[PDB]
């Protein structure tokens, strides 16, 4: 049994794995943050298939790292928004998520400095207050 290749399949698998209640929590933007996290994880895990090009070596960006990232997002959203129905996009602790997902999670396995630079590039492209606009591009010039 193998995981079906594909960003669509990867995101569907991630959404199936995450419990339904955990994503639907008090801040409505938590669902958006989880979607960004799932998309980022799909982008990271897919680039492995192109091992010389997408990365420097076949890292183990498994499900455990995704679980830890989800845990961090929940912890920091609860800390920032203490039982609030709505939270502004700017007040979201973007720096905390970026730093923790560049150093702790997804950054533990990264030994080459250039892989760390590429990870920082994805993190600073995706996780930002700008993403909460309807005009945001998850990818550019795909075709």
């Amino acid at each position: 049994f193998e995981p079906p290749p594909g960003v669509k399949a990867n995101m569907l698998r991630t959404f199936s794995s995450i419990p339904v209640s955990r994503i639907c929590k008090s801040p409505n933007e938590r669902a958006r943050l989880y979607f960004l996290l799932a998309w980022f994880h799909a982008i990271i895990q897919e680039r492995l298939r192109y091992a010389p090009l997408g990365w420097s070596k076949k890292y183990e960006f498994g499900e455990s790292d995704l679980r830890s990232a989800c845990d961090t997002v929940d912890t920091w959203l609860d800390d920032t928004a203490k039982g609030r129905q709505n939270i502004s996009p700017d007040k979201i602790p973007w720096s905390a998520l970026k730093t923790l997902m560049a150093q702790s999670i997804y950054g533990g396995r990264v030994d080459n400095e250039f892989d760390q630079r590429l990870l920082n590039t994805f993190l600073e492209r995706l996780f930002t207050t700008r993403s909460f606009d309807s005009e945001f591009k998850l990818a550019c010039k795909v075709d």
């Binding site: 498994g62 800390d79 602790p93 720096s95 999670i105 950054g107 396995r109 990264v110």
Partner: protein
């Protein structure tokens, strides 16, 4: 019991039992506190030893409890231990609060008083001052950011940065002047922390953080202090990111503070995220990147101690299990170092254990099953697993990873430099770090080199000490000249690149080889351009070195003159001694290390007025348990080890030895088994931790030095813990050795008239010993040749010096024997020149074959000017130098003796020949000086018997043989010493001498190189022999005292190292022992010797006496091509030695002994029969056997032409004593009929299995009977299975009365079972006088140890290992009964044991059966030489065509394949050689 107070659960079972028994002996519990606490090495009590006043560290810093705990009120061990722990926690918390108040007073100040500040530092511990600084800085930054909450406001956080800056400046001013070492460490730690705080505050200013909740501040590690909190332990809260840790408040003592580079902060963030998420972290990465130190520093910063397990290949589990469940119960952290190095099964076991514990820990977010026990795991438990590249599959989902790819060595260097007080630290760091990168890469790789991070830290600490010492020196100079003193003024005008280069040269130049020094200088000029360092030579010490060198007959120089390199090496050793307490000189044997440190000790004694005493201890020679001390398993009594004993003696200061300078020199190889105990002494801690728990503080004047030749097998830990000086072989040149030899000759007399003789001889030899002289050129040439053993310059030079000493003794004896005419100067010069040339030939080429001896002879003839013999072809080695200074041939010295008839081929008799007399002379020379020597030569060749002949020729030297085995250990030497010698007490000391007065005991070692070497390339007996040879004494492990050897000398013999089963000797041992190569006797020597035997043999029958000369000539002649053709290359058993020739003559004499008269044809028939039984049974191929037959025909005709071939050499050469009374020739038919009748009897009595009799069976049964009849009959039966080996062996044994014994070997047949069977056979053999045929097959052998025991039995006729204790006593009783029944009255154990050995060697008979595996044959010959040394072997092979035909007819005779209708075909496919011309049907079927 351990469930209550789980902190002492950390220690093991032994500590638990001891603390239970010795509860009232609180002075003995300090071992447990050393084990379980972090830095607490002892607890401070009063004179009553009943109340715990406080706790103390191993450094000396102590903590006094606010409310002391009285042990009397709580007699129970656990209750008062818990009280002590709670008390230390509370006291640390209260001291923390006090110091936080103090630093808050210090904080918020434009300027700070150095005196009050240093007082605050001295009041509290290093731990407390670092925590106080951290708390004050965190509170100040929090206050500033809270004031920043308005946003767009003025920033007083600049004031925070300015405060940190001004206190950093006062710290930098503090460390420049001299400080107490503990305060120095406190300052270093505080400066490290404040450098980190300044950098992070600068980053916060750069980012313009204005909110206390901003993540850029939250990611920095924050300390929060809450005095209002009731619990003191919960007062201090440490928070970084979203994680929160409550401070451990455990006493860590003093620890190496870790600089927080960006990588280290990343590590902290990752691990605190992992712990907050309740799962451990795994900082994988290459070695030497701070993987372990980072975890340790994280634990220390949180107040937790870490137990760093070392995961080597030799790793324990039960100790690990107990210690690790102890960590679980305590709550303290545990780190695994190089976790991948574990064995896969240990890897899986430890992975399962940590998996269970981690699962329990996540369940906690509580007890778990550990060692079949319930273990309460504290929530604060953490586990880290450093790995070197992955994590086990069962753990990959429970441990976060982190990459330690590269530490920030640049910032580490900068921060340490700034800590030591260096100005311009950044430039120096950016210069030094690439410099060690270049040293690691560009410099040639060597074993002892080390350019890691630790080396950089050591270099920087040493540079700091050097700058401090220069500051102190300039201060004293300004005190002498003028009075203006200003530390800042001196520091500002003090060069700093020069200081760092000086430290680099003082620490790294010593360990460089001669080639790498110009490269290092070029690297320094590349990185630190324009600046240079020139060492200021200690002109005070140089004069003392010159005086001591002149005293000891050495060579001294300065720089480029002769011996300058050695003097520089001694000075570098002096500097390393000055800056280190434990040293290790590395250099090839023959580099002057011993003399270097000895001369340095003498010079320091004569300079500083402090006399020095050296304790030279061999570590490998003595057992580790005796070296460090033994603790009885049952009586629990401690006996101090020799190193422990000498440390105790020095500490005791009984006769003022603390005033003296003691240098315990660990002369010998080092391996990580005993030295791991010494790893606790070579550190800055400097204390010995014995297994009993007691420690002895290392005095400052005691220096532990390891004079080891190479560092291929020492671990990196010991390499880093002590200084290193490299003594290249180029240090002392040949000129220095020559000068030392000549000076020692001129000064000390050899035993004055003979001193004058020595002086005159040295004057004569002086032109030849000069640089580029005859000796030097020959030594250069002799290195070009090939030798039986590895060549060492000191070995050849020592042999030459010893032979020159014998020359001087010869001249002294000559003058003593000619009082009327003392030998004149002219004859002295002639004799000394010729004896010199003789000595070069027999010393430089004394361990080589005749071809290279001749080559060296021709070369020296070309290059010398000394007159030499004009022999057209005879090499000068064949000529001696007579006491008259003339060249006389050795052949004149060779006599012509006639052996008795009854002594032919006897073990004792030795006919002197050319090689015999030459080796007699060399043995005489090397035994006169009591210099141990080794005879190296092929199996046989008379190495053993030549040695015994020379020794028994000398009257006053007794001899004791010791058959060294592959498992020989020095306890054999101890047993021999207590057997033949007795310890006696004398004023100099206890001396070991033989119980017999006026006798020089010699310990002949049968196979000196045979003992196996350990995994670290060490043979224990070799090291012990080296020790007694070189130190002139040894160590009695009974009381650990210097025992001096007197009237004791050693002699060895060995097979060539190239022969498999032999291990090459260590160059340190070979340097002492000259090696003589005893080769196979030549054609002339064999001719003469066996002509002597034959002339002795043929005296029985006078009518045939005139044929002795042609018989011996043919005997040697055939043997010549027999050795020349079947070389060892074709088959591993194709060896030929004069042992075979001796067996030839023995067999011929045995055949001729009973017979009264016998013609020439009978003699040739006997001679051919023995030749076929010795040189033709070993062959494999048929064509080789045909070759042997044809050449024996040719030889017999060549040397006996006037004889009939048909009668003397009739093809069925068969000899047997079964029919007639004598061993006369037997016809094949009569023998066949007799053996057929005997086989019928065998069927009737023993097992009935048909055995057809083809003539090969006749031959094999006769050979087997002949070997069993001869005493010590041992057979190596080889042939394809089922060829009749075992069956014929049993048949012969039954016929001759020997009982067949075979060992029932199964899968569970262990070595003990085989030993028991061998003991049973030995009892059945000698104690019963019943001959045993011992059946052995390689299938019955399951281990090489079986071959080792059998080898011992075959070579000695008995194995002492089998019988011991009650078994030996029962053997003694049985042999006493046997002697009583036979009629011999013996009482002592030795005579009865010798009689038992004689009974076994005359009765017991071992036969070995195997399959013809050529590679297998080589392997078995390699494993056990005894199966190939003396055991005779037969080549059964497979059945020939004739045997197959005969089996076919005889077995298929009952059936009737007689078909008259058969017609002969025109073409018959014949495969049987003797098929009848008309084939019958049955014949055709069998064909």
């Amino acid at each position: 019991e351990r469930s209550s107070f789980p902190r002492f659960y950390f220690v093991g079972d032994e500590d638990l039992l001891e603390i239970i028994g010795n509860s009232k002996n609180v002075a003995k519990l300090q071992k447990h506190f050393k084990k379980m606490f972090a830095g607490v090495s002892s607890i401070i009590l009063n004179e009553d030893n009943s109340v715990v006043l406080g706790i103390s560290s191993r450094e000396g810093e102590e903590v006094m409890f606010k409310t002391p705990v009285s042990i009397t009120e709580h007699p129970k061990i656990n209750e008062w231990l818990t009280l002590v722990e709670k008390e230390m926690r509370v006291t640390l918390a209260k001291l923390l609060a006090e110091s936080v108040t103090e630093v808050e007073i210090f904080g918020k100040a434009t300027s700070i008083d150095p005196n009050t500040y240093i007082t605050w530092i001295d009041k509290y511990q290093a731990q407390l001052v670092v925590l106080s600084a951290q708390i004050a800085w965190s509170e100040n930054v929090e206050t500033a950011l809270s004031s920043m909450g308005g946003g767009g406001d003025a920033a007083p956080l600049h004031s925070v940065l300015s405060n940190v800056e001004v206190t950093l400046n006062v710290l930098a001013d503090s460390v420049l002047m001299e400080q107490p070492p503990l305060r120095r460490r406190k300052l270093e730690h505080l400066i490290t922390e404040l450098v980190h705080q300044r950098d992070v505050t600068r980053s916060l200013i750069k980012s313009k953080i204005d909110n206390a909740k901003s993540f850029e501040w939250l990611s920095q590690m924050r300390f929060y202090f809450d005095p209002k909190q009731t619990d003191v332990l919960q007062q201090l809260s440490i928070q970084m990111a979203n994680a929160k840790f409550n401070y451990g408040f455990e006493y860590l003592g003093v620890q190496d503070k870790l600089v927080q580079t960006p990588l280290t902060d990343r590590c902290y963030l990752t691990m605190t995220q992992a712990l907050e998420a309740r799962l451990g972290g795994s900082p994988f990465g290459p070695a030497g990147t701070g993987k372990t130190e980072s975890v340790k520093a994280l634990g220390h910063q949180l107040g937790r101690f870490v137990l760093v397990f070392n995961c080597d290949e030799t790793f324990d589990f039960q100790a690990m299990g107990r210690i690790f469940v102890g960590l679980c119960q305590v709550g303290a952290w545990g780190c695994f170092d190089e976790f991948n190095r574990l064995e896969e099964r240990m890897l899986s076991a430890v992975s399962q254990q940590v998996q269970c514990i981690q699962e329990a820990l996540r369940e906690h977010s509580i007890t778990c099953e550990l060692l079949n026990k319930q273990v309460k795991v504290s929530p604060d438990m953490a586990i880290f697993i450093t790995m070197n590249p992955n994590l086990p599959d069962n753990l990959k989902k429970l441990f976060r990873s982190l990459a330690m790819t590269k530490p920030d060595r640049q910032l580490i260097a900068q921060v340490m430099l700034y800590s030591q007080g260096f100005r311009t630290a950044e430039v120096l760091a950016n210069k030094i770090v690439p410099f060690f990168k270049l040293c690691d890469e560009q410099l040639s790789s060597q074993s002892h080199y080390d350019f890691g991070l630790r080396a950089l830290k050591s270099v920087l600490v040493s540079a700091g000490n050097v700058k401090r010492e220069r500051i102190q020196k300039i201060k004293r100079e300004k005190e002498e000249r003028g009075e203006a003193v200003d530390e800042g003024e001196i520091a500002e005008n003090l060069p700093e690149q020069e200081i760092l280069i000086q430290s680099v040269c003082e620490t790294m130049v010593p360990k460089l080889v001669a080639e790498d020094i110009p490269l290092l200088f070029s690297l320094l000029s590349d990185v630190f351009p324009g600046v240079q360092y020139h060492r200021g030579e200690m002109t005070a010490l140089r004069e003392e070195l010159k005086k001591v060198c002149q005293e000891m007959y050495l060579t001294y120089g300065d720089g480029e003159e002769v011996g300058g390199m050695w003097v520089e090496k001694v000075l570098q050793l002096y500097q390393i001694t000055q800056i280190n307490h434990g040293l290790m000189m590395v250099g090839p044997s023959g580099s002057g290390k011993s003399m270097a440190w000895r001369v340095l000790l003498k010079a320091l004694e004569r300079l500083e007025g402090v006399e020095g005493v050296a304790h030279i201890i061999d570590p490998k020679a003595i057992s580790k348990d005796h070296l460090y001390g033994t603790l009885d398993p049952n009586t629990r009594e401690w006996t101090d080890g020799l190193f422990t004993h000498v440390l105790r003696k020095i500490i005791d200061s009984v006769r003022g030895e603390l005033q003296k300078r003691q240098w315990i020199v660990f002369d010998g190889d080092v391996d990580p088994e005993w030295v791991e105990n010494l790893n606790s002494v070579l550190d800055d801690n400097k204390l010995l931790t014995l297994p009993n728990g007691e420690r002895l503080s290392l005095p400052p004047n005691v220096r532990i030095m390891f004079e080891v030749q190479d560092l291929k097998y020492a671990t990196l830990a010991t390499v880093s813990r002590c200084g290193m000086v490299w003594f290249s072989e180029d240090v002392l040149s040949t000129d220095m050795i020559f000068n030392n030899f000549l000076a020692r000759l001129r000064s000390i007399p050899l035993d004055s008239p003979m001193l004058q003789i020595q002086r005159d001889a040295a004057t004569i030899m002086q032109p030849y010993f000069t640089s580029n002289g005859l000796v030097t050129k020959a030594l250069e040439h002799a290195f070009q040749l090939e030798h039986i053993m590895d060549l060492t310059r000191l070995r050849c030079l020592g042999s030459l010096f010893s032979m020159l000493h014998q020359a001087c003794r010869n001249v002294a004896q000559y003058n003593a024997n000619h009082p009327d005419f003392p030998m004149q100067i002219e004859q002295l010069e002639r004799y000394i020149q010729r004896y010199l040339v003789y000595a070069i030939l027999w010393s430089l080429s004394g361990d080589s074959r005749l071809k290279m001896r001749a080559e060296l002879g021709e070369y020296i003839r070309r290059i010398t000017t000394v007159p030499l013999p004009t022999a057209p072809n005879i090499p000068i080695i064949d000529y001696e130098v007579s006491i008259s200074g003339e060249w006389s041939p050795w052949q004149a010295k060779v006599p012509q003796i006639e052996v008795e008839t009854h002594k032919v081929a006897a073990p004792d008799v030795v006919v002197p020949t050319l090689d015999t007399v030459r080796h007699e002379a060399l043995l005489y020379t090397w035994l006169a000086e009591h210099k141990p020597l080794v005879l190296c030569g092929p199996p046989g060749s008379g190495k053993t018997m030549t040695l015994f002949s020379a020794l028994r020729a000398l009257p006053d030297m007794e001899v004791v043989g010791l058959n060294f085995s592959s498992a020989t250990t020095p306890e054999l030497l101890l047993k021999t010493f207590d057997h033949y010698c007795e310890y006696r007490r004398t004023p100099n000391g206890v001396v070991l001498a033989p119980v017999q007065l006026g006798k020089w005991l010699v310990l002949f070692c049968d196979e000196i190189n045979l003992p196996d070497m350990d995994k670290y390339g060490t043979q224990r007996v070799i090291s012990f022999i080296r020790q007694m040879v070189e130190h002139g004494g040894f160590y009695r492990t009974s009381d650990q005292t210097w025992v001096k050897l007197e009237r004791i000398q050693f002699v060895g013999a060995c097979n060539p190292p190239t022969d498999p089963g032999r291990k090459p000797l260590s160059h340190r041992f070979l340097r002492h022992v000259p090696v003589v190569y005893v080769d196979y006797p030549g054609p002339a020597s064999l001719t003469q010797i066996y002509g002597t035997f034959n002339r002795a043999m043929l005296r029985l029958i006078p009518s045939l006496r005139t044929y002795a000369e042609p018989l011996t000539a043919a005997m040697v002649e055939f043997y010549t091509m027999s050795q020349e053709r079947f070389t060892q290359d074709t088959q591993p058993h194709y060896i030929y030695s004069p042992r075979e020739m001796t067996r030839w003559v023995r067999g011929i004499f045995e055949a001729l002994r009973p017979l009264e008269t016998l013609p020439v044809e009978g003699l040739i028939r006997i001679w051919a029969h023995e030749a076929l039984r010795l040189f033709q049974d070993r062959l494999v191929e048929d064509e080789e056997r045909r070759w042997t037959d044809e050449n024996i025909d040719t030889v017999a005709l060549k040397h006996f032409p006037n004889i009939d071939r048909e009668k003397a050499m009739s093809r069925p050469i068969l000899y047997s004593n079964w029919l007639s009374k004598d061993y006369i020739p037997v016809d094949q038919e009569e023998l066949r009929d007799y053996v057929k009748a005997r086989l019928k009897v065998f069927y009737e009595e023993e097992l009935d299995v048909p055995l057809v009799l083809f003539n090969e069976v006749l031959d094999h049964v006769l050979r087997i009977d002949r070997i069993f009849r001869q005493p010590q009959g041992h057979l190596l039966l080889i042939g394809v299975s089922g060829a009749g080996k075992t069956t014929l062996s049993r048949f012969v044994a039954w016929m001759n009365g020997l009982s067949v014994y075979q060992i029932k070997v199964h899968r569970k047949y262990t070595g003990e079972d085989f030993d028991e069977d061998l003991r049973t056979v030995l009892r059945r053999s000698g104690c019963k006088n019943e001959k045993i045929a011992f059946i052995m097959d390689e299938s019955n052998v399951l281990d090489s140890g079986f071959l080792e025991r059998m080898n011992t039995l075959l070579a000695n006729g008995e194995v002492p290992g089998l019988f011991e204790g009650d078994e030996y006593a029962t053997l003694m009783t049985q042999c006493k009964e046997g002697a009583q029944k036979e009629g011999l009255m013996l009482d002592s154990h030795e005579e009865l044991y010798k009689w038992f050995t004689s009974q076994v060697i005359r009765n017991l008979h071992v036969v070995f059966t195997m399959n013809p595996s050529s590679e297998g044959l080589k392997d078995r010959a390699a494993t056990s030489p005894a199966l190939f040394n003396r055991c005779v072997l037969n080549w059964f092979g497979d059945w020939s065509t004739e045997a197959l035909y005969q089996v076919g007819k005889e077995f298929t005779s009952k059936m009737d394949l007689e078909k008259p209708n058969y017609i002969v075909p025109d073409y018959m496919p014949v495969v049987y050689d003797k098929l009848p011309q008309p084939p019958s049907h049955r014949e055709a079927i069998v064909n």
